[PDB]
Every structure is written in C-alpha cells, then in structure tokens.
Amino acid sequence: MNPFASLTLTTLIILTIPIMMSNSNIYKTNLYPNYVKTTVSYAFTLSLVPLLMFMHTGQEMIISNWHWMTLQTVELSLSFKMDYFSVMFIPVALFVTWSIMEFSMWYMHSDPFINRFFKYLVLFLITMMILVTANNLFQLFIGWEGVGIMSFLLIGWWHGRTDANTAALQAILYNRIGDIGFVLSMAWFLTHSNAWDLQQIFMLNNECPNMPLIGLLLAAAGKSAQFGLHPWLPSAMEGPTPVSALLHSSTMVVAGVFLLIRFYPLMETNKLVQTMTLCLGAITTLFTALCAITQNDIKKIVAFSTSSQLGLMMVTIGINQPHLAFLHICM
Amino acid sequence: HVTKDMFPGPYPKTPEERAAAAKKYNMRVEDYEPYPDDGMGYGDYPKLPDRSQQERDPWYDWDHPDLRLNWGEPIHWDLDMYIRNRVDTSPTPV
Amino acid sequence: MMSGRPGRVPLQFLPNEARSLPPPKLTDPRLVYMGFLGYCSGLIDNAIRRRPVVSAGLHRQLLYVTSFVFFGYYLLKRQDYMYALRDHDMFAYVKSHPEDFPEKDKKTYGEILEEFHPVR
Amino acid sequence: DSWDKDVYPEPPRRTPAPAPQTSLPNPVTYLTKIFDLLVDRPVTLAREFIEQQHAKNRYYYYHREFRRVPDITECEEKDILCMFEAEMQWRRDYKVDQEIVNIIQERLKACQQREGESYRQNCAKELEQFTQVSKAFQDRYSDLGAHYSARKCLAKQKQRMLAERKAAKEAAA
Amino acid sequence: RQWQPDVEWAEQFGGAVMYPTKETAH
Amino acid sequence: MNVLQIVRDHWVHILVPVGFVFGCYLDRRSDEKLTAFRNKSLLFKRELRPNEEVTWK
Amino acid sequence: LLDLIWLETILPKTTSFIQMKMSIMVSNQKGLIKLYFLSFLITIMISMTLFNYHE
Amino acid sequence: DRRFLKLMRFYILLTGIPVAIGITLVNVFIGEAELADIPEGYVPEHWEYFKHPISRWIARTFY
Amino acid sequence: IRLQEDPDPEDENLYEKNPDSHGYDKDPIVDLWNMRVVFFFGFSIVLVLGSTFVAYLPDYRMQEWARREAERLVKYREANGLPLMESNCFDPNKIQLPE
Amino acid sequence: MLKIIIPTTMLLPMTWMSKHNMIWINATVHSLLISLISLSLLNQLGENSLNFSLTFFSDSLSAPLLVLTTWLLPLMLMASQSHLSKETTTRKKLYITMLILLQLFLIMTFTATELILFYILFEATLVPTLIIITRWGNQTERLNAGLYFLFYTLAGSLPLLVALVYIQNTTGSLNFLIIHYWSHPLSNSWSNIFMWLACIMAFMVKMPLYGLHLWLPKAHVEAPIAGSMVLAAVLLKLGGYGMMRITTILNPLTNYMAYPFLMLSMWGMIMTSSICLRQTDLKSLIAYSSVSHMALVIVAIMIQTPWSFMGATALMIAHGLTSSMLFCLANTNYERVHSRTMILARGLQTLLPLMATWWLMASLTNLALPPSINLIGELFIITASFSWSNITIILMGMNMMITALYSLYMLITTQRGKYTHHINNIKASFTRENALMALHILPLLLLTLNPKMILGPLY
Amino acid sequence: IRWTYARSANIYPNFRPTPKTSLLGALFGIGPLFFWYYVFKTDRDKKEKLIQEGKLDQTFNISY
Ligand SMILES: CCCCCCCCCCCCCCCCCC(=O)O[C@@H](COC(=O)CCCCCCCCCCCCCCC)COP(=O)(O)OC[C@H](O)CO
C-alpha cells in the first residue's frame, strides 16, 4: 500500500476545509484570508510528496471510490486519476494560487467582502482540481461547468459594474457554446464505447472518432478562448486583478487544452482533426497577438498574450506532442 | 392609480387620436410616430428612435442611471435589446 | 336490459330468492360511505339555515345519518342481488350454448410469433 | 478475501528492488519511514481495536437465492398466473446479466490502466471477452424498448433464429 | 388587495342578450 | 397550564396520528382478503416452519 | 407572432369565434308562434320523406 | 440574516450529531455482517438478508 | 363618486410591531412557535431524520444481490470453459419453431 | 397506501376544527408528518411494483413523485402565510381545504391501479386548482386564465375517456399490470392511429409541448403563490406520468406517429426558451421556462428508450422542485414591490444579501449544471436522443446555450446592477421566506448523492 | 406599465391578419417544423437503412 494514492487523494480534502469552515462563521472575520492562504500552502506542501514518488518510480494510481450509481451497464463512480499530467499539475497550480493568495491580501485589502472573495478562490480551486484529476467524462463536466460558473461570479465580483456583468454573461456564453461539443462527446462515447471512464475509451480503440474529437475540439476551443471564441477573455479583464491573475491567466483557461491532453491517445488516430487543431491554433496565435500590440491597457495586453500563448498550445498538441504541450502548460 | 385610457390601445388614424396618444405617452405630436400598421399589434405605441441606452449621455442626471431613463419617458418597445447590458448601438469610429 | 325476466313480479324491491346471498356487513365500505353522505347532509342543512354547523342540533344530523344508512343497506341488497343475477343466468346460458363459446386450444409462447418491432 | 481472485484476475505484481547507487539519499524512503511512523501505525492501532470489538458480536447475514421457475417460452399463453413467474424470472436474469457486463467491463478498465502504455498488446483477452459478451448481450437484451418484457425478448429472440435458419438454408440449399 | 369586479365588469354580464349584435340591438 | 384549554385546542393534534393508525390497520386488513396464493408460487413455496401455522402474514 | 398572435388565434380564438357566431342566432329567435310552428312543418315533412326514416 | 443562519446551523445539528454519533456508534460497536452458506434447517427472516444492522433494523420494524 | 369604496390598505410590515417578527403571524407567541414547529418538524425531523431513512433504506432493486449472484455465475462459467454468456436468452431447445 | 390517504383526508377536518390562530401551525406540523410517512415509500422492490391492494399500488416511478407531493404540501402553506393573512377565518380555512383536497387527489392518482381510476382523479385535480386560480388570484385576467386552463385540459381529456373505455371493451380490464402483461402490438390502421392520437393528446396538454401551451403563460402568472407551485411542480408531471404508464399499450404505433410531436417539441424548446430570453414579467419568464424543460421530457419518453425514461423521471422531479422554488422567489419580490416587471426592481443583492444566494442557487440549478439532478436528467435525455438521431445534439445542445442565457438573465437584471432609487419599502427578508427556500434548495442537493431513488422504474 | 402592456396582451386586440402577418406566421411557424422533419426523417431513414442489412457497427453499443 504505497502512500501515493493516500495523501494525493487527501490533497483535495484539505482544500475544501476552508469552504465548510466559512459557513460555520466561527472564523474571526479578519484572519480568514490568512487562514485560507495557510491551508493552500499546506496543500502545496502536501501535494509536493506525490511528485517525489512519481519521478522516483512513475506509479500512476486510479482512486476509483464510492459507487455513485450503476446504470445497467454503466457504473458511474467518483474516480480520480493520478497520471503524470494530474500529479505534475497539482503543485504548480497550488504554487501559483498560493502566490496569488499572497498578492490578494495586499491588493484586495479594501473591499469589505474580501472574506467572501477568498472563499470563491478556494471554491475555484477545488472545482479545478476535480477537473484535472478525474477518470470519467462526467467528472470532467463537474469541473468544466464549475470553473465556468465560478468564473462568472468572480468576473461579476464588483457586481454593480454593468459592463462587468456583460463580461460575466459573455464569459458563460462562449463557454457553453464550447460545452455543446462536450455533451456531444459524452453522448457518442456512451453510445459507442458504452462508458465515460477514460480507461474504457482508450481500451475500446475508437480509431475513427470524427464526431467525438470534433466535439472535444469544440469543448477545448470554447474554454481555451481560441479564435472564434476568444473575445470573452479580452473582455474578462473587468474583474479584480488577482481574479484575472489566477483564473483567466494560467489555471482556468488552460483547462481547454487539458481535455485534448487527456484524450491524446485518440488524437493521433484522426489526422483530419489534428490538422484542425493546427488549423485553429495557427489563426488564434496571430489574431490575438496582432490585436495585442495595438492596445493601451495593461490588463488587456497581458491577457491577449495568454490567448496567443494558449493558441500556441493547440499547435503543440497538433503534431502528436502531448507531453510537450503539458510541459508548456506548467511553464 | 393609472386609469384605463392611459393604457395603449388601437392604432391612431385621425389626428384626434394622435393628439391624445402624444398626451398619453407624455410626448408631443411633432415627434410622435406610431409603428407601421402591419398587423403586428403594436397599436398606438410610438416608435422611438432605435438607439441603445449606451448612446444616452451618462453625465446627465439619469433617475435610473443603470438604464438612463428618468421618468415617464416612453420606454422603447425594444428596450431590452438596447439596455446597457444587452445589444448596444454605439457609433463605431469606422 | 333484466326487466322482462321470467318470474319478475313488478314493483318489488327485493324478491325472495335474493335473500340466498350473503347480506352486506354493517361495516361495509360502501355502506359507511352512505353514512358519510348522510352526515354531509347534516352539515349542509345547518349551513343552509345559518346555524353552528359543527354542533347545531344532534337530532337533525342523527336522522340524516340513520336514514342514509338505512336506504343504503336495502339498496345494497338489491345491488348485490342484480349483479348476482347478472352473472347467474350467464352461467346457465354459457352451459346452454356450448358451441357458441368453443375453448380455443392453448399453445405456449414457445410457438406464437409476435414479429418483434425494434425501437430506434 | 472480500472478493474473488478468479472473478477479478490480477497478474502477479512484480516490483524491483531499488538500488540508489548515488550517494545522496532518496527522500521518498525517508518520507516512507515517517509516513508509517506518523499515519500508518495509528490507523492500524485504531483499526485492530475496532476489529476485535467487531468480534465481540458476530451477527450474520446470508444471500437470498431464487429457485428457477418456468420461463415464458414454457409459460401457458394468456395465463397470467404462470406469466408473472416467468417475467420475474427474465427480469431477475436481466439484472444478473447486467452485472455480468459490469464485471467484465470493470476488468477491461483494470487492464488498461495497469498495463500502462503497452496496454494495446499486453491484454487483448479483456477486449475480445468484452467484444464477445457485448455482441451476445446485444443479441439478448438490446433494443427491447423502454417497457421491455419477457414476451418481447422471446419475440426478438425468435426473430433471430428465423433469420439465421433462413440464412442457413439459402447457403446450403 | 386582489382585483375585484367593478361596475363595468357587471355591465358585461348585464344586457338582455349577453353578446350584443345588430339584430339584438333594440 | 389550564389543562381544559389545551385539550379543547390540542384535540386536533392527536387526530392525524389516529388516522395513521387507522391507515395501518386497514393496510393489514385488506391484505388478508388478498391472501389467496399464500406459499403456493413455486418460487417461494416452501415447507412450513414447525411451530407457526402461516407464512408471511 | 407565433405564441400570442397566431397560436392563440388558431385553436383558441377561432373556436371561440366559431362558437360565438353559432350561439348568435341559436339564442336569438323572434318569439313568433307562426315562425316556430312553420319550422315544425318542415321538420315533420323532411323527417318522414327525405331523410327516409320511414324506410 | 444572522439569526436565520444561526438557527439552521444550530438546529439542523439538534438531530444532526445524535444521528451522527448513532450512525457511527452502531458501526463500531455492533459491526459489519458477513457472507454465508445458508446453513441447513434455518430458513432466514426477511430482514436478515442485509449487511448493516441499521439497514437490517429498518427492514425488521418497517417493511 | 363612481363607487363608495375604501382606499387600498397598506402592507403591514411585521417588524414595526415586534422587531423579532418571524414572518409567520402578527402575534409574537404564535409566530415564534410557528418558527419552532416549521423548523423542528422541518430540517431535523423530516429532512435530516428522513435523510438517514432513505440513505439507509434496504437494498434498492436488489442491487447488492444482483452482483453477488453474478460472481458465482462467472465462477462456474469461467472455469467450465464455455462462453461467458450465450447469444440467446430462452435457449431454443424447448421452442417450437414455426415451419 | 391507506397509511397516507387516510391521514390526509382525516387531516382536513382537523384544519376545520383548529383554533382561529393555530390553523397554520397544526396544518404545517402534520403535513410535514405526512411527508415523513410518505418517505417510507421510497423502498421499491427489485422488478415488481409494490402492490398494496386492488385499488392502489406503487413502483419505482410513483414513489418519487408521491414523496415530492407530500413534501410539497407544507410549502404552499408557508408561502401563503403572508399574502392571505388579512382574510376572514373561514376563507383561510377553505384555502387550506382546497390544498389538502388537491394533494389528496394527487396521492390517489399516482397510485391508481386502474387506468380508469387514474382518469377520474387525473382530472379531479382540475376542480380545486381552478378554485384557487380564480378565487384568490391576485390580478384581473385570472378569470380568462382560469377558463383557458380547464377548457384546454378538458378538451384533451374527453377524447381520452372514449379511448380507455374502448380499450376496456376490447381487452377487458384496464389494470396497469394486465395492460403490460397482456399487451398486443397495435396495428398501423387508420382506426388505431386515432386511438393513438386520443391516448396521447390528453397527457400532452398538461405536458404542454409547443403550440397548445398557452395556458402556461396564463395559469401561472395570475395565480396565488400556492397554486403556481402546485400547477408547475406536480400536475405537469402528472400529465407526464400517464405517458410512461399508457405507452405500454401503444407500441409499435409510437414510432410512426412519434415525429409530429417530436418535431413540434424539439423545435419548440428552442422557440420557447427564445421567448424566455426576453420577457417583461418575471413569473411569465419562469412559466415559459417550465415549458422548455417539460418539452425535454416530451421528446424523452416518446423516444421510448431505457435511458430516455431513466432521465425523464430525474428531470421531472428536479424541474418541479426548481420551478416551485423560483415561483417563491418571484412571489417574495412581488409581495414587497407589488409589481411583476423584472426591470422594475433591479439591484436586490445589495439590500437583501441572502435572497441573492437563494436566487444564485435557484438559477444555478436551472442552469442544469453538474452534479445536480437537472444536469443528470438532461444529460441522459441527450444520450438517448443522440442514439435515436445523431443530429439531435444540434437542437437540444443549442437549448443549453439559450437556457443558460435567460436563466442567468434574471440574476443580472434583479440581483446585480444598481438598487432602484425610488423603491424604499423592501424590508429585511422574513425568516419564513428564507426557511421555505432552504426546504426547496438543499433537499435537491441531497438527492444528488443518491439519484437511484428518482431515476425511475427502469433503473 | 404602458410599456409592459404593449408587449403584453394588448397586441392581439391590435393584431390584424394581413398576408404579411400570415406569411410570417407560416414562415417562422410550420416552416421550421417541417424543415426539421425532413432532416430527421432522412437521417433516421439512412441510419435504419444501414442497420437492416448489417452495415453499421455498434458492437459495443449495449446501453442505449
Ligand atoms: C378540438 C379537437 C380535439 C383535440 C385533439 C384530440 C385528439 C385528436 C383525435 C381525437 C380522437 C377521438 C376519438 C378516439 C376515441 C377512441 C377511438 C379508438 O379507440 O379507436 C377507434 C377508431 O375509430 C374511430 O373512428 C375513432 C374516431 C376517429 C375520428 C373521428 C371522431 C373524432 C374527431 C371528431 C370529434 C372530436 C373533435 C371535436 C369536434 C367538435 C377504433 O375503433 P374501430 O374504428 O376499429 O371500430 C371498429 C370498426 O373498425 C368500426 O368502428
């Protein structure tokens, strides 16, 4: 019984403690942001250990656990996957949000609702780790819709800003259009491959997933703010800077390409769709960068770099380069 | 509160109805103009200029600053496209 | 339908041979419904006359319940009689015309085809 | 143990004996030692304390068995008295047959993760066994309608041998 | 308070013929 | 506490649980009318336990 | 257009309008015995002869 | 707002914890059931075909 | 006058009479108890206590039984050396094929 | 079932015999007690309905709806404790009597073992619902709305009555069990298709698909809060409950005639949700939303697929709880501001902070996001529909896009923005309202843990 | 209230069934409904056309 599965599955349970602790209201309303930072710091320290036995051995453990329900021949169960992509991404995501937390109590130190804001960040945190760490496509949807809804509230953090609500509404709109491909991917995979677990989809060897991969690409494009579905990210600057420094920069919007990295065992089989990835990645890189340099707003310029960088990632995943794609994600 | 005649009714044809309609919508006859009688059921509701609330000058004291509508001004029939959150007919520089 | 049967002396609410049936028990659910309707009449009567419906005279309501319970029980016997009569003469007829109701032979579902229609 | 080694077959788990030729120690071994001395031992102490407590009263529970009953193909037609037994017989086997796919489906998942990047050739037995099961499962219960019934299942079945027997005769002739 | 019928509502159900017409005008 | 006042008022509270007891009694009354095939279906037909005289009530 | 202009004028209002016109003259007779009994005369004549109910 | 939130959190725990300990208590005082071979001569009872004693007790006194 | 009516009443805010009003009745004693009963027989007695009821309900649809019976069936079928599951359900030995 | 009906009917005199003030107290206490007893029905045996007697029976489809109805019963009482208030005692006593009678009919209907016995109680709910709509309705057009309601559903229900009595004459008993076991394949003759039309139109009126759905904007908007929840959370599903029950005797005639209603509904949910995208009345917006979600079921069951039915029940229970919730939210806003226009009371989160979170969770559930029941309901329909036709996802997928926009539209327009200046009567939220809504939202969150209870009879 | 009333019920009393209204009602009404029917009926027909002779592959499609 290697500890690998044990503490790496804890890594989620420490993160969700501040959420429960908040509604208890026992916390003294001044040190709550400091309390949130410490918990994330402890999670990063804890999540470091799953790395050490990874490079030491490389073991990847599936944590298939409590059986939600068994629909005839579909055993929908909560399950987290400890592949290299998952185990690598936890420390860096925690490390970044830890830095954003430290930046947050300095910058966001005047809003009376600062305690509420920190709760949303932890809420955004846990809904992202269940997206990266998952084994069934349904669980991906929980993280997929969770970050989108969490983004909408966090964009609408300043509430009364009529433009910010429009950006908040616009963010959900482009996200859902991408999610149309996500639901299409689920329906195809549950009809033909007869499951949503990643293991079965890879095993059954769907060598011609033209409709799935197109749906998968559409899910990636909507979330990764690619061309044709980009302008929400440039307009997503209305939220507070720490919000845009964590969600819309390096942790949320990167989830779109993570889906393709998850499903790279099927990406190489269909040559047409991987050209479509190269097709979508190339145009996105130019247009966002081309609009970037003619801007007079610091937040807009930096964000356009992310999308142009984000468009680069799908160029990487195009020609059978998933590991390098995820390498670029971490940096 | 509001009495029956103030509620919008039939299409105005004689100038007596147009004059009363202008009174009904707290506007003048010179600028009053109902929607074309194409059977869509607009009735005597005036056709105000198709310009979003974004066009309205924010600096002027608006009683509803979130919508830039003061009071009793004829609400545009297609208001909720032109509300600040929704569709905006802002004059593009090009 | 009944009306015109042999031995059908008219204006009779309960012919003698009808008594060869199990009389309804006083706790019959049909019978207790008769009592419930009678009680509801008592409430309406006081409501009609603008009286304290709940307890506006225990004499008027008592007659209402008893009368409905009475008329129900006699109606139940005639109810039970005719239905027994309706099924009775059928069995005499069904044995009186054997050729009209021939027993179709029995073949298990291992033989009968049902041309299963797929759903898509 | 709680499960079966044959129903859930596992290849022999063989692990190497790591030899850190480098002078500097591997932290994982240090973290392994502290993990046992910090989490594993207190968990074991509490568990075994519960285990002996559980042994203080060994209340029992059996598994219900339904003896086989005549099926709809032997059921007298329009005879509801035996038809209810046959329908319960078919539906109960449907759930049991559904679990048969689930067991084989789960075994397919286990090989794919366990065999790693060499999953494609390490086990095709799981794939073909699932292929044979799923194909024959399609023959039995697939496309039976929302209100599936033993009568429909027999009707779909009867439609099957009619076609293949007809296909058999034309080939032979 | 909830809406209650006024005199005009009563006049609806108040004619000699409930749905007036030219033939029943008088 | 003026027990007379509370019984005059809270006589309604006891009423519904009585109806529930009424319902349970009728549920175990209508069942015996539907006994018929008791220990007859071959799926559950089984030789009676010695002391008691009846299977499922 | 569809919901509260046509979908209410196809089934609901048209049937209401159809029931309106029919109820217009069914309820509006003239109260003259001459017209009534004359309508009886056709009814009896047409009943025996031309619906052929006697056959 | 605070009185309402204080009310739910305080009161939803009124039968919250007693159930919470009670559910755990029967788990680690009574124990878990175990499989069998249906010993001969013992026709089991309907509630006996269940693992958790809380589940068995429900089937004993309700169903 | 048109009609001799009364002016439309005003929305009686329950708090100006008693500050701790619970939005149940104007009388403090009743509404406070109203809050007591709607809560007690609400979240705890029905929602929380009833939760454990449905949570600890006996095996739904005999789900546990289904797999338990299944495991034995595989054990003979796997060991005997025959296909795990036949393509047909009602085996055609006792079937009367038409024509 | 007499463990539930008998207390319910006997509960009615108790309300009539309670003291002047304790009427709400005693009625709410025992109505919840009835809900607790009804929760015992959630145990469904393996592959057989829980047949209690000849008259009544239950299965893995009626039980989730029954417990929802009984659990709903206290909620109309709570939501009506304020707008009623200033009325004579007897009228309030009558109001409770109508509700209890209405709930009593529903319990008997869902457990009816005879399709005829179903038919009586299925429309017997019309008499109390019409009474509530027209008597205590707080608007003028309730009279025409009430007329639109009963005539629409009765015009559908009358051809039904002729249909079942015909089936009775052809196959004797109409018992739900015997219909399934003794089912025979309906032909394609022009006589059977009209039987198919009659057997479906009555159920699909209270379903309403696109087209004959115009009592939904009328019945819900100008109805008392108690009536709006009841007639949007239960009897809409009551019309649906017949379809799964009655489709047992309509095969294989469904497939040939499935298209006209499938195409009307499937294009409908886009059209209806498009109407939802821009509405002036909040209650109307929620009302049209119910049509879109209900249209998801109509295509669902009438595809006639295992996965389709399993998701159909899940969406039904989830939507009823959500639609019942949002109607409370509109009523709470309407009671304070005495208007229904959405843009009239913009900026409410600033003044009422809790009401925003309730409105956030209400709209969030309407978003059909995972893992809530609404998502696990819609998703199963998508999978069943996609297998039926690969091009379904273009339509029904686009719905989630349109559904998201309007379902968040009221969130932006009412909660966020700016508090309306001239309105100054919005008092702090009464603990009744907040307690009522928690009884709506978090039980949904529980049901996420164990969907198999409401997943339907095909699980 | 005037704005809400104009959008609300007070549209049909001012409605007149001109051929413009009639054409638009049919165009955006029965139009799309029939159009989708042809698309889906064709899609269902071709799909079932492949199934009946044994062309389509659904070897692992069991839960539908
Ligand atoms: C406002 C309009 C109604 C709204 C939509 C409602 C649904 C539309 C269809 C309504 C159907 C009503 C009649 C269905 C009753 C049951 C019919 C049945 O079971 O099928 C019979 C089908 O038989 C019929 O003829 C059914 C009626 C067909 C339609 C004609 C009457 C209905 C339409 C007109 C009246 C209703 C419209 C309102 C008019 C004011 C089978 O009998 P058979 O014909 O095989 O009988 C043996 C032999 O062949 C000769 O009988």
Short mmCIF file of C-alpha atoms in Angstrom, two decimals, chain H residues 3-4 7-8 11-12 15 19 23 27 35 50 52 54-55 58 63, chain I residues 20-22 35 39-40 42-44 48 52-53 56-59 68:
data_model
loop_
_atom_site.label_atom_id
_atom_site.label_comp_id
_atom_site.label_asym_id
_atom_site.label_seq_id
_atom_site.Cartn_x
_atom_site.Cartn_y
_atom_site.Cartn_z
CA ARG H 3 -30.43 34.93 13.31
CA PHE H 4 -31.76 32.76 10.50
CA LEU H 7 -30.94 28.99 13.60
CA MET H 8 -30.36 26.46 10.81
CA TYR H 11 -30.89 23.40 14.93
CA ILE H 12 -30.06 21.20 11.93
CA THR H 15 -30.77 15.77 15.48
CA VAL H 19 -27.68 10.69 14.40
CA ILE H 23 -24.70 6.01 12.92
CA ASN H 27 -20.79 0.85 13.03
CA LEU H 35 -21.39 -13.76 3.89
CA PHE H 50 -28.75 -7.28 4.79
CA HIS H 52 -25.63 -3.04 8.07
CA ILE H 54 -29.18 -0.22 10.89
CA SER H 55 -30.37 -1.39 7.47
CA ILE H 58 -35.25 -0.81 9.30
CA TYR H 63 -41.03 -3.40 5.88
CA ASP I 20 -38.16 39.98 16.22
CA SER I 21 -41.05 39.03 13.92
CA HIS I 22 -40.51 35.77 12.06
CA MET I 35 -40.84 29.10 13.60
CA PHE I 39 -38.04 24.13 11.75
CA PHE I 40 -38.22 21.20 14.19
CA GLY I 42 -38.74 20.56 9.00
CA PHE I 43 -34.98 20.18 8.64
CA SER I 44 -34.44 17.79 11.54
CA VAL I 48 -32.41 15.15 8.46
CA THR I 52 -30.97 8.71 7.09
CA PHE I 53 -34.16 6.76 6.38
CA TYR I 56 -30.10 3.59 4.99
CA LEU I 57 -33.01 2.03 3.12
CA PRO I 58 -32.58 -1.69 2.40
CA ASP I 59 -31.09 -2.80 -0.91
CA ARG I 68 -23.45 -11.31 -5.58
#
